[PDB]
Amino acid sequence: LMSYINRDLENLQERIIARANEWLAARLRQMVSHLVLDAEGKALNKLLDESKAKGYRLNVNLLGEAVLGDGEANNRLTRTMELLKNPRVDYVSIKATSVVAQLNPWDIDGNTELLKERLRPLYRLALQRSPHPFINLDMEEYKDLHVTIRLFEELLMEEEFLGLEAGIVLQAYLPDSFQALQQLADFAKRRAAAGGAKIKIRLVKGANLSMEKVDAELHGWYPAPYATKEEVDANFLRMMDYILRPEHENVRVGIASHNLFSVASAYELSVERGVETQLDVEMLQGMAPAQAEAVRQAVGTVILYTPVVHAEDFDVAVSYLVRRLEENLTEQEARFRESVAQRWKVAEDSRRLSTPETFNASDSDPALLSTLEWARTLEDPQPKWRLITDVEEVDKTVAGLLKSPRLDIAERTALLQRAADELENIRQDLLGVMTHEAGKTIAEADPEVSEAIDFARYYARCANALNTPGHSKFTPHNLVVVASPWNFPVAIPLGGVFASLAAGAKAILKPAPEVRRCAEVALTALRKAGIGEDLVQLMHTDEADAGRRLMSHPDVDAIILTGASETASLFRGWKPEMNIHAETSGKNAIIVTPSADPDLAVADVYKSAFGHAGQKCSAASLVILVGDVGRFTDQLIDATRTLRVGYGHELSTTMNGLISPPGEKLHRGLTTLETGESWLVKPEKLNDEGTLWSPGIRDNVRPGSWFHTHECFGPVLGIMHAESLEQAIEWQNSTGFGLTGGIHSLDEDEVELWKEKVEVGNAYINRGITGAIVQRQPFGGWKNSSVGVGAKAGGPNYVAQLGTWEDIESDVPSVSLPPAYRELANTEFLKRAAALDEIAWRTEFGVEQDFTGLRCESNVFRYRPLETLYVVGDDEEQFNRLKLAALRTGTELRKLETHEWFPPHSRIRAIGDAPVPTTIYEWAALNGSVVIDGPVLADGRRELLHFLKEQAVSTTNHRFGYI
Numbered sequence: 001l002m003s004y005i006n007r008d009l010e011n012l013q014e015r016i017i018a019r020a021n022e023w024l025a026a027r028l029r030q031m032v033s034h035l036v037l038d039a040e041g042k043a044l045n046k047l048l049d050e051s052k053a054k055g056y057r058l059n060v061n062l063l064g065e066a067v068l069g070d071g072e073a074n075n076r077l078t079r080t081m082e083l084l085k086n087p088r089v090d091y092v093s094i095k096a097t098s099v100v101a102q103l104n105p106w107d108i109d110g111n112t113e114l115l116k117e118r119l120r121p122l123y124r125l126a127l128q129r130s131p132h133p134f135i136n137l138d139m140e141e142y143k144d145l146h147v148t149i150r151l152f153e154e155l156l157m158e159e160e161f162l163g164l165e166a167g168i169v170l171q172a173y174l175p176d177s178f179q180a181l182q183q184l185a186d187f188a189k190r191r192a193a194a195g196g197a198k199i200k201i202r203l204v205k206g207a208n209l210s211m212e213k214v215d216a217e218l219h220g221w222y223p224a225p226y227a228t229k230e231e232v233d234a235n236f237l238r239m240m241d242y243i244l245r246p247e248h249e250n251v252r253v254g255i256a257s258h259n260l261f262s263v264a265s266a267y268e269l270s271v272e273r274g275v276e277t278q279l280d281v282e283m284l285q286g287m288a289p290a291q292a293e294a295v296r297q298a299v300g301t302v303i304l305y306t307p308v309v310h311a312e313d314f315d316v317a318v319s320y321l322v323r324r325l326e327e328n329l330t331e332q333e334a335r336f337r338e339s340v341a342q343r344w345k346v347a348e349d350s351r352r353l354s355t356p357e358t359f360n361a362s363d364s365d366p367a368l369l370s371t372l373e374w375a376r377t378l379e380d381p382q383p384k385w386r387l388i389t390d391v392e393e394v395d396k397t398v399a400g401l402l403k404s405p406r407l408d409i410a411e412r413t414a415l416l417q418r419a420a421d422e423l424e425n426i427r428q429d430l431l432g433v434m435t436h437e438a439g440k441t442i443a444e445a446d447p448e449v450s451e452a453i454d455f456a457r458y459y460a461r462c463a464n465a466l467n468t469p470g471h472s473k474f475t476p477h478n479l480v481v482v483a484s485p486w487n488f489p490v491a492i493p494l495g496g497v498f499a500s501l502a503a504g505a506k507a508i509l510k511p512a513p514e515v516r517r518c519a520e521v522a523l524t525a526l527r528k529a530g531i532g533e534d535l536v537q538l539m540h541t542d543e544a545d546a547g548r549r550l551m552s553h554p555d556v557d558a559i560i561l562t563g564a565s566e567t568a569s570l571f572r573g574w575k576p577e578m579n580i581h582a583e584t585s586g587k588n589a590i591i592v593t594p595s596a597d598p599d600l601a602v603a604d605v606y607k608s609a610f611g612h613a614g615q616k617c618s619a620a621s622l623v624i625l626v627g628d629v630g631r632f633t634d635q636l637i638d639a640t641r642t643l644r645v646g647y648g649h650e651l652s653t654t655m656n657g658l659i660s661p662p663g664e665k666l667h668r669g670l671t672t673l674e675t676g677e678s679w680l681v682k683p684e685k686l687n688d689e690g691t692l693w694s695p696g697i698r699d700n701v702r703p704g705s706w707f708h709t710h711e712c713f714g715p716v717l718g719i720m721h722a723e724s725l726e727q728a729i730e731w732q733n734s735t736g737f738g739l740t741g742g743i744h745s746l747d748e749d750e751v752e753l754w755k756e757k758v759e760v761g762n763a764y765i766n767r768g769i770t771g772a773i774v775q776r777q778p779f780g781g782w783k784n785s786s787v788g789v790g791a792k793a794g795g796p797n798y799v800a801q802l803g804t805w806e807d808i809e810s811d812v813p814s815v816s817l818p819p820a821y822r823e824l825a826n827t828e829f830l831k832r833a834a835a836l837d838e839i840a841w842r843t844e845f846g847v848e849q850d851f852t853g854l855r856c857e858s859n860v861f862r863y864r865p866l867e868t869l870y871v872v873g874d875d876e877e878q879f880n881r882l883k884l885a886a887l888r889t890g891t892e893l894r895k896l897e898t899h900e901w902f903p904p905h906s907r908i909r910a911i912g913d914a915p916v917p918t919t920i921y922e923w924a925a926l927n928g929s930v931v932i933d934g935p936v937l938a939d940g941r942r943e944l945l946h947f948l949k950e951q952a953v954s955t956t957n958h959r960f961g962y963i
């Protein structure tokens with residue numbers, strides 16, 4: 001039972017509506033352009049004099065270049081400090097994210113200390129004048145909420161500042177801002193009791209709804225603001241109601257609204273309750289002058305928002321302002337009546353306290369304080385593990401796994417779903433081991449735990465899709481070996497294990513030696529889930545006889561490998577006929593054309609280059625700029641110098657250390673330049689061991705130079721300067737790799753050309769090229785980035801590789817065929833393959849498929865034609881079956897003999913009854929090609945995969961939220 005509830009608003013309702021009607025009684029870029037003023041020009045001082053004379057005070061707010069680095073952050077602060085030295089200026093307002101760039105959401109304690117350390121000179125400037133001018137802390141995003149309130153309350157209780165009247169914004173569209181108001185109102189009572197001065201809250205409804213909904217939909221969270229504007233109008237009245245009392249004399253209030261009903265309410269409440277000296281009204285300078293003057297005569301104090309800017313930042317600042325001003329009379333009086341009634345009934349908990357039902361597992365939310373609380377208490381688990389060195393133990397363990405009988409699809413599905421539940425329960429144990437043993441930050445390790453959970457649920461669904469009624473039958477492998485790397489030490493090992501189980505096989509997990517405790521901690525979830533030693537076996541083999549015995553073992557049906565392409569050739573050399581599916585790094589670029597948003601491009605380039613210190617198969621190693629990209633390079637430099645280098649287990653780290661000191665390749669990338677190149681930012685070695693390296697940026701990296709064609713797997717980004725988009729696309733395509741790639745451009749024709757011409761498995765448009773989410777962006781590369789037939793992990797065809805398919809007897813439905821195909825189909829078998837190709841093409845291969853259907857991001861799964869297929873053997877009928885497939889995809893068939901050469905990463909189809917000659921297998925193992933040696937299937941749903949390259953195209957759909 002809450003003593004703040006009352007009926008004053010109900011009683012004043014009609015004098016309020018009369019008041020609003022009374023005040024209302026007495027293209028766009030042109031307007032905002034004439035309202036932004038030079039922070040140093042005379043125009044501003046004239047407007048301060050003229051408005052002071054008319055009885056107004058001005059809220060001076062400094063706009064400018066996006067605050068991506070400490071350089072520009074110092075600019076906003078020092079330049080705001082200069083305005084507070086101007087005696088005509090009464091009121092400045094600034095945001096935490098303008099004072100600290102790249103505000104790390106996981107380090108609230110450190111962010112607070114940094115903000116206080118940086119803002120004290122500014123508040124001192126307000127103490128050196130009497131009367132003291134006013135500093136307001138603005139709020140835009142939900143992540144600003146607790147750090148800013150904490151900044152406000154700690155700073156204003158320091159002895160130095162105890163008597164300074166200062167202010168802070170609450171956004172009423174956040175339900176939990178009602179709780180923030182109550183805590184701030186108590187804080188003001190605690191402060192007054194200590195002899196301190198009042199605080200002031202500026203009440204706003206909220207200007208960031210668009211990006212707040214995007215932030216939610218991307219992560220699988222509820223939006224932080226209310227779902228409807230009625231709730232916002234209601235909470236605006238509730239917060240006003242609560243705070244405009246004599247009980248809270250120490251909290252002055254700025255009502256910031258052009259809604260005359262909202263303002264008339266605060267006016268009438270202040271008069272009825274005798275708290276007129278706590279009510280200022282804050283409005284937009286120049287927007288509604290006739291209204292604001294009516295308001296002034298009633299309320300007294302009216303404070304006009306006045307945007308100012310540094311000269312160069314003018315056109316930049318006008319665009320920021322255009323979005324804010326765009327996105328934000330009897331049916332007006334009725335919507336107000338309703339908000340008066342809902343005032344006390346609207347929610348007050350934070351929408352982020354729980355999560356909507358989504359398919360993808362949702363990440364940890366550092367906007368919740370309960371999240372930041374367990375992030376402080378993470379542990380350093382040290383599970384025991386054993387090294388396998390005896391080949392006879394590999395043999396004993398392998399045969400023991402084969403003896404367990406196959407589980408049926410229901411049992412596998414139940415185990416996988418349980419495995420995903422249990423992984424979630426140890427998310428914090430996984431974070432503990434990943435941030436110590438693997439050296440990852442929380443921001444990098446936490447989505448990886450989500451990926452590991454998603455693999456279990458996704459591949460569970462896929463396993464059911466194997467028995468879908470159709471024209472072929474799947475038979476799983478008995479045993480798959482998963483050889484995993486260290487950079488993603490939970491999701492990649494588990495993803496291969498889950499895929500094997502879903503297919504019907506037993507799995508051996510052999511984890512990379514740097515991250516053996518990661519595998520052990522993850523294994524405890526599988527065990528809790530019911531996945532015992534008869535199903536999955538963890539084998540820490542060496543890389544000598546026992547490891548080789550495991551990878552070459554006659555009873556291992558496939559290896560899933562993530563690592564160096566030299567490792568894939570090594571393994572296959574030991575058994576060239578082996579099934580191997582390998583993801584093997586990439587040399588990935590982001591193209592930035594003059595039509596790009598330079599700031600969004602910089603944020604995506606630097607985050608893609610430097611997450612996990614660049615230790616990603618998908619990392620952005622190259623940025624290729626077309627022509628002149630303006631502020632891009634300066635901002636990229638500022639953002640890169642601002643990354644905090646340190647160990648992953650330190651909350652303040654925003655770029656972690658390396659897994660071990662650089663090898664030859666990476667040390668070269670860090671220390672030495674090639675001809676004509678220069679360091680825009682030169683990497684520095686920051687500790688004796690050589691694991692902590694600051695990031696670097698090479699300029700003038702030329703096509704075919706060493707850094708263009710060698711993945712260093714470290715914190716090094718190279719800039720190439722291209723004369724045209726067409727040339728930049730040539731350069732992006734000639735790295736030897738084809739894993740990830742992105743373009744930044746707001747020009748639709750450039751994007752369409754890029755979507756068609758770029759040769760990468762994972763394409764991204766106007767966003768980062770890392771962070772692939774299961775089913776949203778199925779992950780896998782072309783060219784040297786992949787070994788095998790190559791279905792994408794986290795895509796619908798991956799499980800189906802872990803076995804073999806055969807044609808079955810079935811009745812084909814009636815579907816029409818174009819006559820060119822029927823000319824080729826001169827057999828029972830060939831007619832059956834012609835028809836099934838048509839159906840598969842209609843069902844799957846000819847469709848661009850967005851499985852997740854997000855509003856803010858288009859995520860497309862499509863098939864691209866394989867250009868050339870090599871054919872080994874002689875069999876006219878089967879060769880005609882391949883001509884049918886090639887006529888439909890456009891692929892070129894090339895007949896291939898023994899000892900005839902073929903390029904690296906080729907696909908070679910085996911036809912006929914003869915074995916494939918061994919030399920072809922041996923050569924394929926050296927240059928990473930794949931000999932497809934199963935029977936030729938009539939069912940194109942299976943056979944056509946040999947003629948297609950899977951591809952994910954992910955495109956941002958919104959322009960700062962608008963879609």
Ligand SMILES: Cc1cc2nc3c(=O)[nH]c(=O)nc-3n(C[C@H](O)[C@H](O)[C@H](O)COP(=O)(O)OP(=O)(O)OC[C@H]3O[C@@H](n4cnc5c(N)ncnc54)[C@H](O)[C@@H]3O)c2cc1C
Binds near residue numbers: 140173225227229
């Ligand atoms: C002087 C001044 C200072 C300001 N300072 C800030 C600041 O520091 N931080 C900040 O975030 N904004 C700030 N604002 C903007 C404020 O938050 C509003 O966006 C704006 O003033 C318009 O709202 P309203 O009360 O005029 O009119 P209205 O038409 O009454 O209110 C519009 C508001 O309703 C809300 N809304 C509309 N549709 C929906 C929906 N479908 N679901 C949920 N909510 C919805 C939005 O918050 C929207 O802004 C400031 C505004 C002024 C005038």
